[PDB]
Amino acid sequence: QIFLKILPQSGPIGGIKSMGITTLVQYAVGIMTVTMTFKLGPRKATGRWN
Amino acid sequence: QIFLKILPQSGPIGGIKSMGITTLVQYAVGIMTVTMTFKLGPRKATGRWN
Amino acid sequence: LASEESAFYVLEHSSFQLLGTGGTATMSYKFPPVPPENLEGCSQHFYEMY
Amino acid sequence: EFQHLIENYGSIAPDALTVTISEIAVKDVTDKTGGGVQVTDSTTGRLCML
Amino acid sequence: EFQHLIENYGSIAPDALTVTISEIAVKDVTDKTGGGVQVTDSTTGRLCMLVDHEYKYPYVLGQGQDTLAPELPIWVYFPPQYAYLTVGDVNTQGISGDSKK
Amino acid sequence: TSVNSAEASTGAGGGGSNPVKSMWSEGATFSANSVTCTFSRQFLIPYDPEH
Amino acid sequence: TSVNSAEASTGAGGGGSNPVKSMWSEGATFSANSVTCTFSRQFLIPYDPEH
């Protein structure tokens, strides 16, 4: 399993009047590229007429 | 002891009317990673029946 | 209700990667040898093989 | 591709797997002029991958 | 991990310590449209970090004070402001008898 | 005009990019004679309006 | 004054630049004994106001 989240960046704290502990609004995007290989077995030989 | 403080940055001073001496509102965030090694001594051998 | 056997997993208590904007990360996995799925059928009944 | 698979081959089994997460973009969201929100790519935003 | 430690070992003693401050981000705060504030990453902003390897400054750690890092990895640390106590001369404030160092 | 005119579009600010890889080190690795414990915490130095 | 004076001009924010070339891999490559299938999907992880 591949677990993905966004690191919770913290909001400003300090001399600003009554800020409070908040989080910066951040969301992630990306491209997930998944490659799977499959071993393949050849078709069985056919002796039919039809 | 590791002391941390944000380097203060000065506000603009110049042609702007009555700007005054100010400081840019800056706060710092980061990740503090602490690794400690502990020497461990093996459990003493025991000869109890129970 | 939770018990002593209940597994409370905290994923932040592990080593994972932090990837910035534009970063990439790859996972590789190798399937164990598994029985192939047959893509061809049967032209006979196993009870009519006489 | 599935039609080609089931036409040209006799059996299929999984062999390997590769998952690539690229073009990661952590994006901050703030308020744009005239209402609504606007999105800006984040230099320090980190995607936690485990 | 503490259960494993106290179950599988007979003694423990600290040996080495490594502290790494990484993912540093000094962030400017400015006014946001429609009220509030917004945060922008700073390229020129700096964080002054000083490691007192020589113990030049007074040591205040190890006094059992409410300054510890969060017990859970999900919480954010707010490192305490550094202050120290030093010796001085006790002087009486007038005739009231109050004394200040 | 405005970006609100589009039915389901969101305005963009065109920020920067930083393709860096860093580790959030955590957990304890036990050995026969020692244990190496690591914990990572996000820390915040607040804004000091006057030092 | 504002950029609205020129009816054929729009304001610019002067964002950054990133001359990077990446690949959108997809499709299946068949062989005599194996097939390598690849698919790419854009994924979005939403903002989590409380972790």
Side-chain angles (χ1 to χ4, degrees), chain A residues 14-32:
Chain A
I16 308 311
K17 309 293 185 185
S18 63
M19 254 332 298
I21 320 148
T22 58
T23 41
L24 304 180
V25 185
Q26 287 181 342
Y27 76 101
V29 306
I31 295 177
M32 165 201 49

Side-chain angles (χ1 to χ4, degrees), chain E residues 8-71:
Chain E
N8 295 255
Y9 296 93
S11 91
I12 177 175
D15 174 59
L17 164 66
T18 300
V19 176
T20 300
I21 286 171
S22 55
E23 286 308 321
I24 301 167
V26 183
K27 297 169 162 295
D28 328 292
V29 184
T30 183
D31 290 312
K32 193 186 71 199
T33 315
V37 315
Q38 68 166 341
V39 167
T40 317
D41 268 318
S42 194
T43 307
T44 68
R46 293 289 174 272
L47 179 73
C48 327
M49 155 163 196
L50 161 59
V51 190
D52 202 8
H53 287 290
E54 325 294 336
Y55 309 100
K56 168 197 302 185
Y57 306 104
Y59 206 85
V60 304
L61 297 172
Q63 307 296 325
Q65 295 198 276
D66 194 334
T67 73
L68 275 172
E71 61 176 60

